[PDB]
A paper describes a structure:
GenB2 acts as an isomerase, converting C2a into C2 by changing the stereochemistry of the chiral center C-6′. Four genes encoding PLP-dependent enzymes (GenB1–GenB4) identified in the gentamicin BGC and a methyltransferase, GenL, from outside the BGC, are responsible for the last steps of gentamicin C complex biosynthesis. The structure of GenB2 shows, as expected, a characteristic PLP-dependent enzyme class I fold. Similar to other enzymes from this family, the active site of GenB2 is located in a deep cavity formed by a groove in the interface between the two protomers of the dimer, and each subunit contributes with essential residues for the substrate and cofactor binding.
In order to gather insights into the binding mode of GenB2 substrate gentamicin C2a, we have obtained the structure of GenB2 in complex with gentamicin G418 and gentamicin X2. G418 is produced from gentamicin X2 in earlier steps of gentamicin biosynthesis through methylation at C-6′ by GenK. G418 binds to a groove in GenB2, which is negatively charged and agrees with the complementary charge of a positively charged substrate. Also, several aromatic residues have face-to-face interactions with the sugar rings of the substrate. Thus, Tyr124 interacts with ring I, while Phe133 interacts with ring III. The ring I interacts via hydrogen bonds with Cys9 and Asp392. As expected, ring II, which is most deeply buried in the GenB2 structure, engages in a large number of direct and indirect interactions. It is possible to observe direct interactions with Lys227, Tyr342, Asp339, Lys202, Cys389, Gln390, and Asp392 and indirect interactions mediated by water molecules with Ser338, Gln340, Gln390, and Lys202. Interestingly, Cys9 in the complex of holo GenB2 with G418 adopts a double conformation in our structure in order to interact with the substrate. Our ligand-bound crystal structures show that the thiol of Cys9 in conformation 1 can hydrogen bond to the C-6′ amino group of gentamicin C2a and could, in its deprotonated form, be the base that deprotonates this initially protonated amine, allowing it to nucleophilically attack the internal aldimine.
Residue numbers in the entry:
A (entry chain A), B (entry chain A): 1 to 414
Write the structure that this text describes.
């Protein structure tokens, strides 16, 4: 086709054989009027639900005013205050339009302050070539080294380059590793004096009202947000200590301060607080995951639930996931492949029961269509592969694997 | 304040002492209800006028549908077809959210295809550190060399690095240099086989329905657009030959394909065609500039008009511009400093006469407030300084200047 970039982080791939035309709350609707429970939510950018009435009213009033970009100083500063006030310490906030822009800007700030170039990384930070994964110990074309969330690989990069690193940037994750495991990655870098960036683009405002790493007893020099803050409107930020944010003074685009996205984001943060969204998702998602695990068990299918609350995953072999996903779609349940699911604030009350009923039907048709899968075992390699897709790293060194085997595994995935 | 990035390319700086609350058509309105003719138009991102009724209806319908990101395949492909169809050749289109993202992506594509790193540049391509200006012959921190629109500096970089360059990226401009001058910059690079990027972020869809360089008898391997295509909504693109666009397949963000901006952009391109916008601006802007020059002449003030149509500039010393701009604001006319003005499609009919009447009053109060300025001469250095701010380069080597003097001048501006 003529659109060159319809690949990568594009959501709703399971539904490419149907046509989605409307979204409302927890549901999206196809061209035939069928409602589907949406667990993609634009890859987690929709934290409140589609067409949230308060976000929509704020955007509509802003559009109808016609106020041009960079004129709504009170609103822009207010959103910055909202974001900074949820982080421990004294932060300034620089706004961008995508998560990739925010993470590259955070890295650029660290390079400007330290005068160093090399960056070490765990996780996916966006589409820019600076974030392209290369094997352990091999700097990519923009001088970024990738450590795959392993403390031993962080230790190697620190042993060889601690004096040379502008920063370490870590995307936290908690489905397959603990908060203590994530905190240890940050602390190893802090102890040698390396600037830290907590890449909260995925989890910021999803797991709690602020940065996920705060609850892991971590503080970072800079934090990046995008998905959680704006309910599907294109806004992101770097929030961090003044020393690192001052070099971003001129990091501005013509439409950095277009008003509709600021209105959406400020309303989103207020609504997340008002509806107690992250705490309620912890409860409702836990119920979904526990009941899903029970249904899988009674049907003897080779799937395991991992995680809970706002971030959980159907762990299974690729061959099994390729059956699960179409069977769920046929029952009106949209799941993202090779990733966590992304429930929104609308995944509460009867919506959870509706989703469970649809999953129950999908598991029944799956077992009837593919009886050869009933009784199949989930292997260690299934679990490792599922973790590597979800968190873009290894969930610690798997039991029985040497560090060399970990490096060979990761290299083979690229 | 807590917003770290309120500097740089932020529009409406002349109005930082007043509060703008509404925009409609050619006008914005302050908190006291006063209407001001807007010649910033969000630094030229508003090509149709604030709250264009057709763009607004398309956006509102899209917001009210709640359709999530990446679901409106027909609309996304349609916009790509609209853009590619206005360029000679067979293009594919990769979408981004800001002009800076598009120009960095175009440069990255050239690096991927050629396997080379060094880039040569004329003009401003955005806020990323890769676009930070350094003196002639000094590569910046991301291996970009800056040539300041001078053919002799392009020749030096080609003499030293032609075999090494991934691409040359040129932002065209036509206020202070001719289309033939711009074409020569591209042709010098073509002849030695270097990939060319026409950075049309400012002029694409402003001067004609497509790339400005097309009318200068230029073709480029890639083109970047942003300001002209979306009437203030955050959307940009790289449009170019398949060989260069294929490496951008995975250059995607979660909200690359959020629907409101695509609806705005597709409606904007249709409206620009329907209202014959660029041709009509050529006429109305020419009338404004000619009459403005006449009024300046009768009042004997040290200002010269440069350019015409959709892109013109009040050329004067910084000391004079600092009087002109507040005096124009006091008469309800918003001008951008140290740049061209950016009239929109609403700058037609009686709006042009209204703007001329306001300018006439501002010139009268200026002459009465600052009688010492009456009869002052505009110097060569005034003209060169004005060109350097507007086009981020030299308008050819000024008369009587050596190439060394040009290099020293540019170095002193950084
Ligand atoms: C197979 N090589 C992959 C490479 O393709 C790429 O994978 C990304 C992956 O990281 C992204 O996925 C990542 O980002 C998404 C978010 C963007 O929606 C998160 O939801 C998800 O948890 C995270 N794994 C996915 N969206 C696209 C793949 N091409 O980056 C990591 C990698 C291992 O190098
Ligand atoms: C004084 N050093 C400057 C440096 O500050 C910067 O200048 C930019 C300038 O290029 C931009 O201006 C540029 O981009 C704007 C567009 C973005 O609105 C265009 O309208 C304008 O014609 C163009 N000159 C201006 N918006 C911000 C300055 N800091 O980039 C060029 C430079 C010469 O290195
Ligand atoms: C953790 C993380 N960091 C950064 C990014 C990049 O953000 P974006 O897709 O908005 O460019 C992503 C991908 N969305 C992400 O999940
Ligand atoms: C010619 C040119 N190129 C690229 C850019 C960068 O675009 P943006 O401000 O949208 O990031 C600009 C500045 N807007 C520009 O004028
Ligand atoms: Cl709902
Ligand atoms: Cl009007
Ligand atoms: Cl961006």
């Amino acid at each position: 086709m003529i659109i060159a970039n319809a690949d990568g982080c594009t959501p709703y791939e399971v539904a490419r054989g149907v046509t989605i035309v409307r979204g409302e709350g927890a549901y999206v609707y196809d061209a035939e009027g069928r409602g589907l429970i949406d667990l993609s939510n634009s890859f987690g950018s929709v934290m409140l639900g589609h067409q949230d009435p308060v976000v929509t009213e704020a955007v509509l009033k802003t559009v109808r005013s016609g106020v041009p970009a960079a004129a709504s100083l009170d609103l822009q500063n207010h959103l910055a205050e909202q974001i900074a006030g949820d982080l421990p310490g004294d932060q300034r906030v620089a706004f961008f339009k995508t998560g990739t822009a925010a993470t590259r800007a955070a890295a650029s700030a660290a390079r400007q302050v330290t005068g160093k170039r090399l960056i070490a990384s765990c996780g996916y930070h966006g589409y820019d070539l600076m974030w392209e994964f290369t094997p352990p110990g091999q700097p990519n074309s923009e001088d970024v080294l990738h450590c795959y969330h392993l403390p031993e690989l962080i230790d190697q990069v620190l042993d060889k380059h601690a004096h040379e690193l502008a920063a370490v940037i870590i995307a936290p994750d908690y489905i397959h590793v603990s908060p203590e495991y994530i905190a240890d990655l940050f602390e190893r870098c802090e102890r040698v004096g390396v600037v830290t960036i907590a890449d909260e683009v995925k989890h910021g405002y999803r797991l709690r009202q602020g940065a996920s790493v705060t609850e892991a007893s971590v503080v970072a020099d800079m934090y990046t947000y995008a998905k959680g803050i704006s309910n599907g409107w294109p806004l992101s930020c770097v929030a961090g200590d003044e020393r690192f944010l001052k070099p971003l003074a001129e990091f501005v685009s013509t439409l950095t301060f277009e008003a509709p996205s600021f209105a959406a984001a400020s309303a989103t943060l207020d609504r997340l607080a008002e509806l107690d969204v992250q705490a309620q998702l912890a409860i409702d998602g836990a119920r979904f995951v526990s009941e899903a695990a029970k249904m899988i068990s009674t049907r003897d299918l080779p799937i395991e639930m991992a995680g809970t609350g706002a971030a959980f995953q159907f762990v299974c072999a690729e061959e099994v996931e390729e059956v699960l996903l179409p069977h769920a779609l046929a029952e009106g349940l949209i799941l993202e492949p090779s990733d966590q699911q992304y429930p929104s604030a609308c995944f509460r009350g009867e919506v959870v029961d509706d989703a469970l009923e649809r999953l129950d039907r999908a598991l029944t048709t799956m077992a009837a269509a593919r009886p050869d899968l009933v009784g199949r075992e989930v292997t260690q390699l299934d679990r490792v592969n599922a973790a590597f897709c979800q968190m873009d790293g290894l969930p610690g060194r798997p039991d029985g694997w040497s560090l060399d085997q970990c490096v060979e595994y990761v290299t083979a995935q690229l």
